[PDB]
């Protein structure tokens, strides 16, 4: 969260394992694994999304049988902002991988192109 | 001699005991891996969900030709085991199919209890593998068989349902070869009850249960019931299923599939 | 006892390798007919009947794979000019890799996808594939669906699925093309991929299919009389 | 310093950590009786039901006067803990009330978080103890308070609802004496979060939860929020409840109480 020093708030980020409907609001999203992330004390969350899968290895294509899950972020509270402070705060987004990470079956990719 | 069969809280004893055939000779157990990376404990309702769930009663007649269920389809309507299946992502379970059918010393007729792992079924129309989800899962009332094959020709209103033939068993095999599955034959001459213990068999170690069905219980009348002189006669057949060593993992929001 | 049972073990029961497919390949200009400049083949076992009924005794199985390519060719004109030797490129493609769309695309450069440049006239090529099942076994006869149409969906055409299909694209495709250029004459060639299993370990036997198959599923349409006629008390 | 508060699967950490007050100095535990006559094991979903359930968000204003919930009323609508409460006969549970309320450095105002065991309430009409079941349990949205006492005079249409007064706290005691309960004071000057751990307190060892309510969470504004110059301002207050060491016993059929 790259906002001001004075503005605070609480943001809830959740995970939903697949096989259900997509989560839309806070009432049906807090059931899964979630982190009540704060803004006052620290300014960086950490969400170790676990490895809950029926198969051992999932695929890397959009296939409906082996689906990852869902990720949703909700306002826990309204962003309390004192006066004489901008109203449009901003938030970035990162990704990583822990030490239990592995792939197999090397192949070639699709993002590059050559029309010649 | 009399079996005192108690799993969990309920109890089925008997006035006369016959047999107990374990499928493939391996009793159901938990996950026993000392070098497993998740050593934290999932939810194992091992003494709080083992009630003997009893399905609906079907009336077996003379010209009726068979019944078939799916597991774990036949528990989604009732029982707290149904609530521990919609909320969680995946699980594993071992079943105790206990089919009883009592009648007098003067009846006759032979039944057959089956347990087919990965029991597929055939369609009816010329559209291949084209079957909706509501007809794919009969739930607790179960489907039936048919004597001869009668496909669909209407191209405007799609039926999208199964139509298996009894001596083809739905899959496409002969009936006389079906005894290589784990089975038990209710011969009405001697005994009236039967039971089968099923372990968890799947390619994975653990799987979802909404989009998958492990076992399919097929009941086939090997010889039709004839009474002394009449031509219409109704005795019931009642099937009881209980989970054993069941466990789940991965909570999510509630998922309610439609059933038309 | 002196009866060697080892002739009919599981490694010897699948020891004979059979045919799985036949793939065409041609070499001419792209006309208004079917452009057979290259042909793709969906990788499956259930395209013949010698091997499908031989594998579908068994519910769950895991086994390593060995392929074999056989290449023959012909002509289309009587007193044709004597053409040269040819080079066929069998290129394997996993799922997610880009599908080639013409004779010479950038995806034919085999940037990382493993392929075999084959020379016509020499011995048949003979490659081996280890176990590529993502679960602990391959799954003959999957039951359920891939997707479940929920109650609060948009409509019924989105949540619909296909009965008994674990994956939309099962285990990738093959791709075969001629390396040489187009010619005024054309050489029709056929490719017969063979397949031999090894290291086979199976589980949970089931009775074999007897009425003939009808498509990739488990259903049936025709020839519903599997047994013949024979008198009861007569030998 | 920063609290890493993880019970079960979900996790509430913080940017700034303040306190954790255990009610009555005893951490929640199981049934520890070596000479107990039932030594068989009930259903203990101890690592499969400890999600941080979050109630609905109320908008705290200037002239708003308070909120109150009941436990285990506030979990009957949602969560699989709600399904393990209707089916079983009786249970026991320990709660983690975690009330957070964040605002800037320029606000003011003081809150008060309470936890009253056996929190009774007063009626409104002259008919004594005459209150229906729908108004007896607000569920997840929670009830409110009122500034002055305004009873009912209509004898034709019975209201049959509560009407507590805030500085009488519903029971009939002064507000200044309410701090002998376990409590925690959200002072908006320093900290923004608060938490209370509640053990199971009842006359029995174990009790039903449909017809009984152990804890009642009362939130009282000790000083009203004033901003710099304006007169209408809305900050939220969000309450989180999670069960700990919960267990149930005695399955029965499903019981659905009406809620008008
Ligand atoms: C280096 C380049 O060329 N080589 C070859 C290559 C070929 C095939 C490869 O993958 C293997 C395939 C195979 C294991 C197939 C089989 N199999 C066994 C069951 N099923 C399957 C399952 C469900 N639906 C359809 C069939 C199925 O597809 C990999 C590499």
Short mmCIF file of N, CA, C and O in Angstrom, two decimals, chain B residues 9 41-43 45 47-48 51 79-80 83-84 87-88 251, chain D residues 9 41-43 45 47-48 51 79-80 83-84 87-88 251:
data_model
loop_
_atom_site.label_atom_id
_atom_site.label_comp_id
_atom_site.label_asym_id
_atom_site.label_seq_id
_atom_site.Cartn_x
_atom_site.Cartn_y
_atom_site.Cartn_z
N UNK B 9 -22.51 -45.18 15.78
CA UNK B 9 -23.53 -45.14 16.82
C UNK B 9 -24.69 -46.10 16.58
O UNK B 9 -25.17 -46.72 17.53
N UNK B 41 -3.44 -32.06 10.97
CA UNK B 41 -4.55 -33.01 10.99
C UNK B 41 -5.78 -32.43 10.31
O UNK B 41 -6.24 -31.35 10.69
N UNK B 42 -6.34 -33.12 9.30
CA UNK B 42 -7.61 -32.69 8.72
C UNK B 42 -8.81 -33.00 9.61
O UNK B 42 -8.65 -33.47 10.74
N UNK B 43 -10.01 -32.75 9.10
CA UNK B 43 -11.22 -33.10 9.83
C UNK B 43 -11.56 -34.56 9.56
O UNK B 43 -11.88 -34.92 8.43
N UNK B 45 -14.29 -36.89 10.88
CA UNK B 45 -15.45 -37.29 11.69
C UNK B 45 -15.66 -38.81 11.64
O UNK B 45 -16.53 -39.34 10.94
N UNK B 47 -16.17 -40.99 14.38
CA UNK B 47 -17.18 -41.52 15.29
C UNK B 47 -18.40 -40.62 15.40
O UNK B 47 -19.25 -40.85 16.26
N UNK B 48 -18.51 -39.60 14.55
CA UNK B 48 -19.63 -38.69 14.60
C UNK B 48 -20.42 -38.62 13.30
O UNK B 48 -21.42 -37.89 13.24
N UNK B 51 -23.42 -42.97 10.81
CA UNK B 51 -24.77 -43.50 10.94
C UNK B 51 -25.11 -44.36 9.74
O UNK B 51 -24.63 -44.12 8.63
N UNK B 79 -28.56 -36.24 5.70
CA UNK B 79 -27.42 -36.56 6.54
C UNK B 79 -26.43 -35.43 6.63
O UNK B 79 -26.24 -34.64 5.70
N UNK B 80 -25.76 -35.35 7.78
CA UNK B 80 -24.73 -34.35 7.98
C UNK B 80 -23.47 -34.68 7.18
O UNK B 80 -22.64 -33.80 6.95
N UNK B 83 -23.61 -32.42 4.36
CA UNK B 83 -23.11 -31.08 4.61
C UNK B 83 -21.59 -31.04 4.64
O UNK B 83 -21.00 -30.03 4.25
N UNK B 84 -20.94 -32.12 5.06
CA UNK B 84 -19.48 -32.18 4.99
C UNK B 84 -18.97 -32.56 3.62
O UNK B 84 -17.79 -32.90 3.49
N UNK B 87 -19.37 -28.37 1.45
CA UNK B 87 -18.49 -27.30 1.90
C UNK B 87 -17.03 -27.57 1.61
O UNK B 87 -16.30 -26.64 1.26
N UNK B 88 -16.58 -28.81 1.71
CA UNK B 88 -15.15 -29.07 1.57
C UNK B 88 -14.78 -29.32 0.12
O UNK B 88 -15.64 -29.57 -0.74
N UNK B 251 -11.79 -26.17 3.17
CA UNK B 251 -13.08 -25.48 3.25
C UNK B 251 -13.22 -24.42 2.17
O UNK B 251 -12.24 -23.81 1.73
N UNK D 9 -7.20 -22.26 10.26
CA UNK D 9 -6.67 -22.04 8.91
C UNK D 9 -6.50 -20.57 8.55
O UNK D 9 -5.50 -20.22 7.92
N UNK D 41 -14.96 -41.27 21.98
CA UNK D 41 -14.58 -39.94 21.51
C UNK D 41 -15.73 -39.29 20.74
O UNK D 41 -16.23 -39.87 19.78
N UNK D 42 -16.16 -38.08 21.14
CA UNK D 42 -17.14 -37.34 20.34
C UNK D 42 -16.54 -36.71 19.10
O UNK D 42 -15.37 -36.94 18.77
N UNK D 43 -17.34 -35.93 18.38
CA UNK D 43 -16.84 -35.21 17.21
C UNK D 43 -16.19 -33.91 17.67
O UNK D 43 -16.87 -33.03 18.20
N UNK D 45 -14.32 -31.13 15.83
CA UNK D 45 -13.71 -30.44 14.68
C UNK D 45 -12.84 -29.27 15.14
O UNK D 45 -13.20 -28.09 15.08
N UNK D 47 -9.53 -28.55 14.10
CA UNK D 47 -8.73 -27.91 13.07
C UNK D 47 -9.48 -27.78 11.76
O UNK D 47 -8.88 -27.41 10.74
N UNK D 48 -10.79 -28.06 11.74
CA UNK D 48 -11.57 -27.98 10.53
C UNK D 48 -12.75 -27.02 10.62
O UNK D 48 -13.47 -26.85 9.63
N UNK D 51 -12.49 -21.24 11.43
CA UNK D 51 -12.35 -20.09 10.56
C UNK D 51 -12.77 -18.83 11.31
O UNK D 51 -13.65 -18.87 12.17
N UNK D 79 -21.66 -20.53 7.80
CA UNK D 79 -20.59 -21.36 8.31
C UNK D 79 -21.03 -22.78 8.56
O UNK D 79 -22.17 -23.07 8.90
N UNK D 80 -20.07 -23.70 8.40
CA UNK D 80 -20.34 -25.10 8.67
C UNK D 80 -20.45 -25.36 10.17
O UNK D 80 -21.00 -26.40 10.57
N UNK D 83 -24.00 -25.70 10.73
CA UNK D 83 -24.56 -27.01 10.45
C UNK D 83 -24.23 -28.01 11.54
O UNK D 83 -25.03 -28.91 11.81
N UNK D 84 -23.10 -27.87 12.22
CA UNK D 84 -22.80 -28.72 13.36
C UNK D 84 -23.47 -28.26 14.64
O UNK D 84 -23.09 -28.73 15.72
N UNK D 87 -27.82 -29.98 13.90
CA UNK D 87 -27.97 -31.42 13.89
C UNK D 87 -27.70 -32.05 15.25
O UNK D 87 -28.39 -33.01 15.62
N UNK D 88 -26.74 -31.55 16.01
CA UNK D 88 -26.38 -32.22 17.24
C UNK D 88 -27.22 -31.72 18.41
O UNK D 88 -27.88 -30.69 18.33
N UNK D 251 -26.30 -36.92 17.74
CA UNK D 251 -26.95 -36.59 16.48
C UNK D 251 -28.46 -36.80 16.56
O UNK D 251 -28.95 -37.66 17.29
#
